[PDB]
């Protein structure tokens, strides 16, 4: 379907029209797992990764 990729993509998309990823590793867990039910430790890991080199 979509995955992590298609997750971190979209958010890109949002970004580069007009958008931001909450600098805060809660309010980017809480963003990203309750938006695209991110629950996975390891999805939330490398999402967040990618927020801190984002």
């Known amino acids: 379907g979509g ?3 298609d997750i971190k993509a979209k958010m890109q ?3 580069e ?3 931001s990823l909450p ?3 809660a309010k ?3 963003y990203v797992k309750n938006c ?3 629950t996975d430790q390891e999805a ?5 990764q990618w927020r ?3």
Do not use: C, T
Not at 44 to 48: A, G, R, T
């Open 23 to 25: 600098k805060v590793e």
């Open 28 to 30: 980017f867990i809480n």
């Open 36 to 38: 695209f039910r991110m």
């Open 52 to 54: 801190k080199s984002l």
């Open 44 to 48: 939330i890991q490398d999402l967040w």
């Open 13 to 15: 998309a949002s970004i």
């Open 3 to 5: 995955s992590v990729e």
């Open 17 to 19: 029209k007009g958008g």
